[PDB]
Design a protein around this ligand. Structure first.
Ligand SMILES: *C(=O)[C@@H](NC(=O)/C(=N\OC(C)(C)C(=O)O)c1csc(N)n1)[C@@H]1N=C(C(=O)O)C(=C)CS1
Length: 356
């Protein structure tokens, strides 16, 4: 059976990474032709002696940005925002400031020109975040240079929230997650689910969870189970099978906005021409693309067959999601220890290419 063939493939390619990087726990999911396969290894909690299972909640880290993107696509297609609007229109305390000449799409796709990977260490309180954006001044020409930025998509998320007259946590938990059919996906894990919330483990194998941070939720703050992430990949593979509002939201996240070498930047998702070589997928995670600013080029020819992926990490967790529309296949990897991005991409590449 397919069940045993997939289990064997994941056992050969993913299971060895547990001994190699000393990973307490892992969840790997495959969806093929609307059939879900769930593999669980090791411990959700070392001290509590809890096995990883279908209820285990993991930190998605930067894979959170896919839900922020989906929320933006939902708001835009319900006419709550336009991608040509500026933050001042919704956050009135930023009206007539320099950041108010950056549009929402530029914030969402990291092209503000002067927003780094992280906020400064001193930015913490709601007031210090508002001050940081009021005191913001341009550097590189607005819209020309991609620099991967938590603050950038953070502000986009806050604006999307204001546009729908809810806090961001409520936008996901009350609108987007239910619309996608996600039952155990959280910005804030409730008291009744804390026994299902995995500990992350650092490079010394000490337990750690993600700390509150300035505009954390939209950038890296979402937690989910393997079954919920498999449902999210199913939605991305079959957006036609969902209500108009969320279908339009999903399709909005799949549209390439600009290009950097072999990579097309969509809303949240990273987009590639399919078939993609292993090295094209590894290049997306290169220090050059991730750490440093890069000149963006216009889309000349939109690739006819596309493929999408996203890596994510916190101090304690690793995440990788990938889906190929034309093959009706996708994969999710969740670990409660950071492993190198290259090892996640390579393992996923072998499994997806080998599946019949
Ligand atoms: C999304 O996953 C981003 N990661 C983060 O913002 C966090 N960690 O990033 C690293 C670079 C690992 C760090 O040590 O700060 C993060 C969020 S909350 C928390 N406790 N850590 C991007 N991910 C990576 C990555 O692959 O790890 C990056 C290279 C740059 S930011």
């Amino acid at each position: 059976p397919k069940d045993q063939e997939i289990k064997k493939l994941v056992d050969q390619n993913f299971k060895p990474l547990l001994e190699k990087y000393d990973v307490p726990g892992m969840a790997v999911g495959v969806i093929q032709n609307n059939k879900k396969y769930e593999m669980y290894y090791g411990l959700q909690s070392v001290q509590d002696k809890k096995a990883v299972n279908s209820n285990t909640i993991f930190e998605l880290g930067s894979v959170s940005k896919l839900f922020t993107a989906t929320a933006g696509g939902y708001a835009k297609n319900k006419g709550k925002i336009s991608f040509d609007d500026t933050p001042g229109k919704y956050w009135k305390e930023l009206k007539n400031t320099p950041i108010d000449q950056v549009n929402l799409l530029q914030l969402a796709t990291y092209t503000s020109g002067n927003l780094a990977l992280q906020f400064p260490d001193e930015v913490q309180t709601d007031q210090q975040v508002l001050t940081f954006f009021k005191d913001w001044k341009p550097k590189n020409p607005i819209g020309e240079y991609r620099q991967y930025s938590n603050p950038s998509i953070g502000l986009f998320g806050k604006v999307v929230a204001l546009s729908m007259n809810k806090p961001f946590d409520q936008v996901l938990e009350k609108t987007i997650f239910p619309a996608l059919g996600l039952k155990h996906s959280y910005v804030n894990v409730p008291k009744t689910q804390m026994q299902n919330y995995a500990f992350g483990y650092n490079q010394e194998n000490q337990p750690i969870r993600v700390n509150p941070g300035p505009l954390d939720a939209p950038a890296y703050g979402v937690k989910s189970t393997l079954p919920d992430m498999l449902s999210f990949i199913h939605a991305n593979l079959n957006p036609q099978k969902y209500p108009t509002d969320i279908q339009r939201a999903i399709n909005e996240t799949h549209q390439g906005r600009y290009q950097v070498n072999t990579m097309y930047q969509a809303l949240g998702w990273e987009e590639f021409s399919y078939p993609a070589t292993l090295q094209t997928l590894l290049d997306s995670n290169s220090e050059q693309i991730v750490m440093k600013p890069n000149k963006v080029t216009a889309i000349s020819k939109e690739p006819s067959v596309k493929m999408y992926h996203k890596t994510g990490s916190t101090s304690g967790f690793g995440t990788y999601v990938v889906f190929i529309p034309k093959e009706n296949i996708g994969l999710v990897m969740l670990t409660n220890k950071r492993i190198p991005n290259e090892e996640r991409i390579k393992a996923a590449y072998v499994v997806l290419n080998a599946i019949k």
